[PDB]
Design a protein around this ligand. Structure first.
Ligand SMILES: CCCCCCCCCCCCCC(=O)SCCNC(=O)CCNC(=O)[C@H](O)C(C)(C)COP(=O)(O)OP(=O)(O)OC[C@H]1O[C@@H](n2cnc3c(N)ncnc32)[C@H](O)[C@@H]1OP(=O)(O)O
Ligand SMILES: COC(=O)c1ccc(N2CCCCCC2)c(NS(=O)(=O)c2ccc(OC)cc2)c1
Length: 411
């Protein structure tokens, strides 16, 4: 039973979801003038706060709340440790709305107790192909197509309640106040993901990881040496052999992405993302923000042939705190971000991702089975983790789709 989510304009059951035939709004059409001008009421010892993402001390505050209190895995082996530089990057894309970043602080000492962030995203989120076909079969083409144009909506991330304040219903208050700020901006949909089941996902996928430094990985979690390896003479040398990578990229013509590559990257990325039912649209400014290399944050490489960019990949860095270890308190993880291949097989492109990551000191490469990530799992020796990432809309009816029909990477 769901005392908050039952009240919200989301599909409430899988049964309800299975029934959905067209993309479209759930809720009453509303107008900005209907929405309360003032912040949602909160207890007199709490105050709403809009952090200034240009203030190092505000970013620091958010950083520490998330370092101590954000996402842990089911077994509490790790907790994400997103960096200050990463947060400034993720929270401040072009045309971001400062008012969309919502915090609660304790009035007396200004201790940050909770946070949620929204950023703009331009998302294709019209009726998926398999449902459009079914629509043509019913005569229902126009309805199925009504909402095809990319929409300017809200992408929610970084919801976090301090461990001291858990299970006191503070999260629904944060979501209501975020929903108010976004609505006042004349935006009525959001997209968000979670590693937990909520009412009700439009897509779900497994996590997949690829060891880059198996020595350091056993030393934490991987249950020491992976069980299947114990059964031989020298497990660690065998493990290292399994995961070993070349020192330098295999693709000649691979180089770091530069500002003048922005138009070409935008084109091959947009062409590639059209094959997916749900996916982002990026302007030149957004391509530049999300994909231009930034030290310790995002890394992006292009294959340039004959002075033309024909392929590219990107990955971003999220360290995790290793929850109970000594020798090793940090896990240095690289996450697969956007890419596009047109001159080589995807696995050959992504092998260079792994080589670059390994060369730069990353311990593991992580991803969700979105995009065409499944097409290189086996050859590049990725293994499924215990995670599942569920994708959700707020105020949007959407048929269930496979994760391989999802092109939105969640930072
Ligand atoms: C148009 C614009 C719309 C904009 C907004 C779109 C909606 C955005 C929605 C948010 C998208 C976030 C995307 C991400 O960032 S996903 C990452 C979420 N963050 C973490 O997991 C960090 C560690 N955990 C925590 O900080 C807390 O446990 C959280 C904050 C998750 C819950 O706090 P707490 O444990 O102290 O509980 P409560 O008593 O305050 O609240 C209980 C209610 O909260 C519902 N709950 C539990 N976990 C989540 C979850 N991940 N998404 C949405 N709802 C969740 C739960 O079912 C229950 O409602 P109900 O079952 O009684 O009905
Ligand atoms: C908060 O999660 C982490 O920080 C993390 C870091 C690394 C992970 N894996 C697990 C396998 C061995 C260690 C490296 C790769 C994993 N395992 S995971 O299976 O990728 C995973 C990722 C996110 C998630 O969100 C609730 C649950 C599971 C998690």
């Amino acid at each position: 039973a769901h005392a908050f989510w039952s009240t919200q304009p989301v599909p409430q059951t899988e049964d309800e979801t299975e029934k959905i035939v067209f993309a479209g709004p759930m809720d009453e059409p509303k107008t900005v003038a209907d929405i309360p001008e003032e912040p949602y009421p909160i207890a007199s010892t709490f105050e709403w706060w809009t952090p200034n993402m240009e203030a190092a001390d505000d970013i620091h505050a958010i950083y520490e709340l998330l370092r101590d209190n954000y996402v842990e895995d089911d077994d509490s082996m790790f907790r994400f440790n997103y960096s200050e530089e990463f947060l400034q990057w993720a929270l401040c894309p072009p045309n971001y709305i400062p008012d969309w970043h919502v915090a609660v602080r304790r009035k007396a000492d200004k201790k940050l107790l909770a946070f949620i962030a929204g950023v703009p995203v331009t998302l294709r989120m019209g009726t998926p192909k398999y449902m459009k076909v079914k629509a043509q079969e019913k005569g229902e083409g126009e309805e199925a197509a009504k909402y095809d144009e990319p929409r300017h909506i809200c992408e929610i991330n970084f919801l976090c309640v301090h461990k001291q304040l858990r299970e006191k219903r503070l999260a629904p208050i944060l979501i209501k106040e975020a929903t108010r700020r976004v609505n006042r901006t004349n935006v009525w949909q959001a997209v968000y993901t979670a590693g937990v089941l909520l009412p009700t996902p439009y897509a779900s996928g497994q996590y997949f990881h690829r060891s880059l430094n198996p020595e350091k990985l056993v030393e934490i979690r991987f249950s020491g040496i992976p069980a299947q390896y114990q059964k031989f003479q020298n497990p660690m040398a065998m493990l290292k052999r399994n995961y070993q990578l070349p020192s330098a990229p295999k693709n000649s013509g691979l180089r770091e992405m530069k500002p003048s590559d922005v138009p070409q990257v935008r084109r091959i990325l947009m062409n590639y993302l059209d094959s997916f039912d749900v996916g982002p649209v990026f302007s030149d400014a957004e391509i530049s923000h999300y994909l231009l290399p930034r030290d310790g944050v995002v890394f992006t490489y292009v294959v340039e042939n004959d002075k033309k960019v024909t392929d590219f990949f990107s990955f971003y860095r999220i360290p995790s705190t290793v929850i109970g270890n000594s020798n090793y308190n940090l896990l240095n993880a690289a996450y697969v971000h956007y890419y596009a291949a047109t001159s080589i097989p995807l696995h050959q492109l992504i092998l260079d991702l792994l080589i670059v990551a390994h060369s730069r000191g990353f311990d593991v490469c992580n991803m969700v089975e979105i995009l065409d990530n499944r097409s290189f799992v086996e050859q590049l020796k990725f293994g499924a983790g215990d995670g599942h990432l569920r994708y959700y809309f707020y105020n949007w009816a959407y048929p269930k789709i496979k994760p391989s029909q999802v092109a939105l990477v969640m930072l």
